Design an enzyme around this catalytic site. Structure first.
Site, PDB file in Angstrom:
ATOM      1  N   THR A  16      68.780 104.943 -46.461  1.00 58.18           N
ATOM      2  CA  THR A  16      69.683 103.538 -47.301  1.00 58.18           C
ATOM      3  C   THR A  16      69.942 104.003 -49.111  1.00 58.18           C
ATOM      4  OG1 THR A  16      68.413 102.401 -47.455  1.00 58.18           O
ATOM      5  CG2 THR A  16      70.091 101.760 -45.518  1.00 58.18           C
ATOM      6  N   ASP A  39      81.961 130.195 -37.061  1.00 57.35           N
ATOM      7  CA  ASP A  39      81.597 131.118 -38.556  1.00 57.35           C
ATOM      8  C   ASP A  39      81.236 132.417 -38.262  1.00 57.35           C
ATOM      9  OD1 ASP A  39      80.308 130.786 -40.768  1.00 57.35           O
ATOM     10  OD2 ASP A  39      80.573 129.011 -40.777  1.00 57.35           O
ATOM     11  N   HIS A  69      76.868 132.757 -43.804  1.00 53.18           N
ATOM     12  CA  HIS A  69      77.396 131.326 -44.333  1.00 53.18           C
ATOM     13  C   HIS A  69      77.169 131.377 -42.913  1.00 53.18           C
ATOM     14  CE1 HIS A  69      80.621 129.275 -43.903  1.00 53.18           C
ATOM     15  NE2 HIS A  69      80.542 129.184 -45.538  1.00 53.18           N
ATOM     16  N   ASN A 161      87.366 123.126 -50.516  1.00 50.65           N
ATOM     17  CA  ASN A 161      86.427 123.058 -51.694  1.00 50.65           C
ATOM     18  C   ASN A 161      87.598 123.114 -52.968  1.00 50.65           C
ATOM     19  OD1 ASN A 161      87.327 125.875 -50.997  1.00 50.65           O
ATOM     20  ND2 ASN A 161      85.585 126.888 -52.436  1.00 50.65           N
ATOM     21  N   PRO A 175      94.599 114.779 -37.455  1.00 49.50           N
ATOM     22  CA  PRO A 175      94.010 113.354 -37.476  1.00 49.50           C
ATOM     23  C   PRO A 175      92.913 112.971 -36.507  1.00 49.50           C
ATOM     24  CG  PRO A 175      96.075 113.141 -38.075  1.00 49.50           C
ATOM     25  CD  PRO A 175      96.127 114.467 -37.711  1.00 49.50           C
ATOM     26  N   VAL A 177      89.928 115.326 -35.507  1.00 52.20           N
ATOM     27  CA  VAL A 177      89.384 115.121 -35.529  1.00 52.20           C
ATOM     28  C   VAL A 177      88.108 114.473 -36.770  1.00 52.20           C
ATOM     29  CG1 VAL A 177      90.155 117.591 -34.681  1.00 52.20           C
ATOM     30  CG2 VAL A 177      89.452 118.089 -36.538  1.00 52.20           C
ATOM     31  N   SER A 224      81.664 122.963 -46.441  1.00 47.95           N
ATOM     32  CA  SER A 224      80.656 123.905 -45.296  1.00 47.95           C
ATOM     33  C   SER A 224      79.567 123.570 -45.039  1.00 47.95           C
ATOM     34  CB  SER A 224      80.612 125.582 -46.080  1.00 47.95           C
ATOM     35  OG  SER A 224      82.174 126.095 -45.355  1.00 47.95           O
ATOM     36  N   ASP A 260      78.449 104.115 -51.812  1.00 51.00           N
ATOM     37  CA  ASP A 260      77.408 104.202 -52.320  1.00 51.00           C
ATOM     38  C   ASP A 260      77.433 105.358 -53.238  1.00 51.00           C
ATOM     39  OD1 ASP A 260      76.155 102.293 -51.958  1.00 51.00           O
ATOM     40  OD2 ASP A 260      74.801 103.051 -49.555  1.00 51.00           O
TER      41      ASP A 260
END
Ligand SMILES: [Cl-]
Length: 279
Positions: A16, A39, A69, A161, A175, A177, A224, A260
């Site tokens: 938390t 990938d 990657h 990114n 939408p 996924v 990623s 948060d």
């Protein structure tokens, strides 16, 4: 279970609060689930995968990860030290070449492959696909991701990114996924993270330590790296019987740490993936 001196993103997913370094999780650890890492491949021989990783498909001359990657992303899903779901089965689907690039037609083929191939695998607790990839908007790429999700796979995809609205990228803009943005260890949106209404969740994405090729480790940054935190979390929650492939993205948003994160644009969800694990 407690993993001391854990990577910050694993500690963050079971906390938390930011600023802790122990990862807490149910010892079931995604056993009996499957995660496909679509990938550059997975170095399945890495000791960190303990024999739980295998390559099942490549579209290139080798199934090996000549980039790193895909190995890194697979490590965040399910490696013994660096992973969220430390007992999941990892299946590698090499749609990206060793320069980290792939044609959309190949990426689509790899998604349709996973939708079928799960019927060849033992995944009694459910199936996840992690897609730390994308490019410009494509209705065909979004449709492939939507089919894979419809087929009963929890699909997690990187927001991208570009520090831009993810509406203009695929499969991020699909939408149906789970589209994943990135945060840093101080609960700020990562400087590169895409945002927008098509995001479902944030996960740790800045300075993420995981497996690399040549039996090594390194820390890299990206949506990623956030995506496989969420893919691993889904696998872990599906093993626990808390959610299904069809509803895991919703369940993760429902159970997230709310409000948060800093530097979340107005109209983007302020939700950080959380396992709500109570010892
Ligand atoms: Cl293969």
């Amino acid at each position: 279970a407690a993993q001391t001196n854990a990577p910050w993103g694993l500690a963050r997913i079971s906390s938390t609060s930011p600023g802790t370094s122990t990862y807490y999780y149910d010892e079931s650890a995604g056993q009996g689930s499957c995660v496909y890492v679509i990938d550059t491949g997975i170095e399945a021989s890495h000791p960190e995968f303990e024999g739980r990783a295998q390559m099942v498909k490549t579209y290139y001359y080798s199934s090996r990860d000549g980039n790193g990657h895909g190995t890194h992303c697979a490590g965040t899903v399910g490696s013994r030290t660096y992973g969220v779901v430390k007992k999941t089965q990892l299946f590698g689907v090499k749609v990206l070449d060793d320069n980290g690039s792939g044609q959309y037609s190949t990426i689509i083929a790899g998604m349709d492959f996973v939708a079928s191939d799960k019927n060849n695998r033992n995944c009694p607790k459910g199936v996840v696909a992690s897609l730390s990839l994308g490019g410009g908007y494509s209705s065909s790429v979004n449709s492939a991701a939507a089919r894979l999700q419809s087929s009963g796979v929890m699909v997690a995809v990187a927001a991208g990114n570009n520090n831009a609205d993810a509406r203009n990228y695929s499969p991020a803009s699909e939408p149906s996924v789970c589209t994943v943005g990135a945060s840093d260890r101080y609960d700020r949106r990562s400087s590169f993270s895409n945002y927008g209404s098509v995001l479902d969740i944030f996960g740790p994405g800045t300075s993420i330590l995981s497996t690399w090729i040549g039996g090594s480790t390194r820390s890299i940054s990206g949506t990623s790296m956030a995506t496989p935190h969420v893919a691993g979390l889904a696998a872990y929650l599906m093993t626990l019987g808390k959610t299904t492939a069809a509803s895991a993205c919703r369940y993760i948003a429902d159970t997230a740490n709310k409000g948060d994160l800093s530097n979340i644009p107005f109209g983007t969800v302020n939700l950080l993936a959380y396992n709500n694990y109570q010892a």
